[PDB]
Amino acid sequence: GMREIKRRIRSVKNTRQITKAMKMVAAAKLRRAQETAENARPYADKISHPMLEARPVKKTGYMVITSDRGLAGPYNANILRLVSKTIEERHQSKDEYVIFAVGRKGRDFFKKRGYPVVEEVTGISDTPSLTEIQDIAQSAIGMFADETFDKLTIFYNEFVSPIVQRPVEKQLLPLTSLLPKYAETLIYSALLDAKASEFGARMTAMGNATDNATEMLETLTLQFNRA
Amino acid sequence: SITDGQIFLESDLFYSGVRPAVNVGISVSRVGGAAQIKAMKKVAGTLRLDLAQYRELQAFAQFGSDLDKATQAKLNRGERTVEILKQDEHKPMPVEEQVISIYAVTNGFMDDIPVEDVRRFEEELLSFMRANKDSLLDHIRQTGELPDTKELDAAIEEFKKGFTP
Amino acid sequence: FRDREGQDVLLFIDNIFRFTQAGSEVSALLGRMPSAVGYQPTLATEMGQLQERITSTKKGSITSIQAIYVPADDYTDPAPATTFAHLDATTNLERKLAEMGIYPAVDPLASTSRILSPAVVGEEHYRVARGVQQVLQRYNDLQDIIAILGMDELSDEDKLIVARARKIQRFLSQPFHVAEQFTGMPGKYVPVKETVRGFKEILEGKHDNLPEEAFYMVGTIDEAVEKAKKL
């Protein structure tokens, strides 16, 4: 009782080292996103369709957003949780939905349990700039634009506080209340919101993480001395 | 305060099966590379630094997330170095073989190779030289500075390509 | 029994520490040095004089199991230090494992032997053991992980090698003949040949499908499948 409960101690120490230094970044990084978000607003604001008018009703397409390279507590395992609960009733058909998996953590989920996935956008980025999803966005529209999509949809990880963020699913292509660049930017709107939320969700799990280490450490330490 | 350096043997390491359980960090030779052939004195020089860096980033053990920065460039290739340091009991390795082996990993020839695969890739790299590239080996046994590099890198790559990772 | 009779005798000394401490009393009585920590000038010598007779001769034999207590709990103390110089393995009875059910309550991680070389027990046994060790060690790391990161974000493989740890931890317990008269299982003697094999299969994943309480208190791995047919 004098050796590899100190390993447990040193290791738990190290973990403590990094979760807090990444807690630093979760807020370093995913607050910047807020800037690179409320900037869209400007152009996000300047505002029978090509067909982006309410029509019915066969093959629908999903676009579920998740972190790739994630360490953000549940906020990634409870949006997959939600596409995999809501499609549970929308699948008595073998149309097989089809998802546009953005982010590698949702990606892998979808290729372990068949879904399947017609697109898997490589490596998110944290900016995320202009040339990044103007593919999957553009081509997720392109599949409504003639015409294998009667409806599009993202699974957005909406950002309330940095302490919370809610699994939300919006609908994109069949609009509501030549120019569908709107759709493309809508996907910005979420892809951008989906970011904050992740690291929003990431520092929250990192503080909790740090703390949990301290605590747990302070448990372990009793064993360091009293046999 | 009497000797000229000390080799420290970490107890932790030894019951992690790591052998020899040497703690290269705090361990030293005050005499230094003065007693060290040119070849080894060279390939080692970098290696001191190599796992010195891997000592710090060690903490980020089973959490490969930092992507591209001081990441799997340092860390991932540090894990590789620590493998060639390991060494079976009663299996002294001739300098020459040590030197190639070190140079192999230290020049990234293991980087495309796995990590559970480093130990064998070394054992089999050497056996390959002893029977083929002895020219290079004996060159180090005679005023051993190793050279003919690039011919060295070529000779390695003609065993490299993995073909069994 | 070693020298005559040529067998492999045991010899248990309960509190060998008391022995070196008897050494100190006698020395004082004889008006010797003593060391600056109270002990005899001849601590080591006397220990060696005892310990050195406990050995494997060519007629072969004596293996001493020595209970070492020392109340102070400082094992850097000269008395324990000296005794340790002679040890070749330590077995660590753990209250935690006892109140957990594992009844040879031996700490798998704390216990050690210098003859756990591949040279002494062969590469396989050695690799299986270093195999079980890492798993059980990993189990502890992950233990602290879920503590501070929840079972959320637990690699399917990591989550996997946690189940094998729980099985190993259990397949490490076994019914004693001596305990028969209470439990009555009855006893089990398990050849290393079969122990090694046993844990090798667990490690290779040859029994993930079995219920984890199926390895608790069995002999060979063969006996564990027998019991995967209950509950």
Strand partners, B9: B22
Residue C153 contacts A where some CB pair is shorter than 8 Å: yes
Please, what sign has the CA dihedral across residues C103, C109, C113, C118?
Answer: positive
3-state secondary structure of C16: helix
Which residues, including other chains, have CB under 8 Å from residue C106's CB and lie 6 or more apart?
C91, C92, C93, C94, C97, C172
Tell me which method was used to determine the 3D structure. Answer: X-ray
> Tokens 């490299």 label which residue?
B160
| Entry resolution (Å) | 3.1
Chain A residue closest in CA terms to B10: A3
Alpha helices, DSSP H only, in C39-113?
Answer: 43-51, 78-84, 95-98
Angstrom distance (rounded) from CA C189 to CA C176: 8
- Cβ neighbours of A7 in B, within 8 Å: 12
Cβ–Cβ below 8 Å for C130 and B17:
yes
Those residues whose C-beta lies under 8 Å from the C-beta of residue B135, and which sit 6 or more positions away, are: none
Determine contact: B11 vs chain A, CB below 8 A.
Answer: yes
CA torsion C86-C90-C91-C93 (nearest 10°) is 100
CATH number of A48-177: 3.40.1380.10
Is B55 in the active site?
A: no
Distance CA B25, CA B10 (A): 10
Element (H, E) at A110: helix A104-112
Question: Quick one: DSSP state of residue A173?
Answer: S
Are the beta carbons of C133 and B62 separated by less than 8 Å? no
B58 interaction partners in chain A (CB closer than 8 Å) = 14
Rounded to an integer, what distance in angstroms lies between the CA atom of residue B33 and that of residue B41? Answer: 6
Domain B37-162: which topology?
Lysin (1.20.150)
Domain boundaries, chain A: 1-47+178-227, 48-177
Chains that touch A (3 or more CB pairs under 8 A): B, C
> Is there a contact between A129 and A37 (Cβ–Cβ < 8 Å)?
no
Helix (H, G, I), strand (E, B), or coil: what is residue A122? coil
**How far lies C53's CA from each of A66, A196, C16, C56, in Å?**
69, 72, 15, 9
Strands C89-90 and A119-121 come out as unpaired
With CB atoms and an 8 Å threshold, state whether B89 touches C117.
Answer: yes
The CATH number assigned to the domain with range A1-47+178-227 reads: 1.10.287.80
Q: Do domains A1-47+178-227 and A48-177 have the same CATH topology?
A: no
Alpha-carbon distances of C98 from A213, C104, C107, C210, rounded to whole Å: 27, 8, 10, 24
Beta-bridge mates of residue C106: C93
| Interchain contact A148–C (C-beta under 8 A) | no
Nearest Cα neighbor of C54 from C10, C6, C19, C120 is C10
Contact C74, C68 (CB under 8 A): no
What tokens appear for C35 in the block?
A: 């060391």
d(CA B37, CA B145): 7
B64: closest chain A residue by CA: A69
C228 CB-contact burial (10 Å; exposed 0-12 / middle 13-18 / buried 19+):
middle
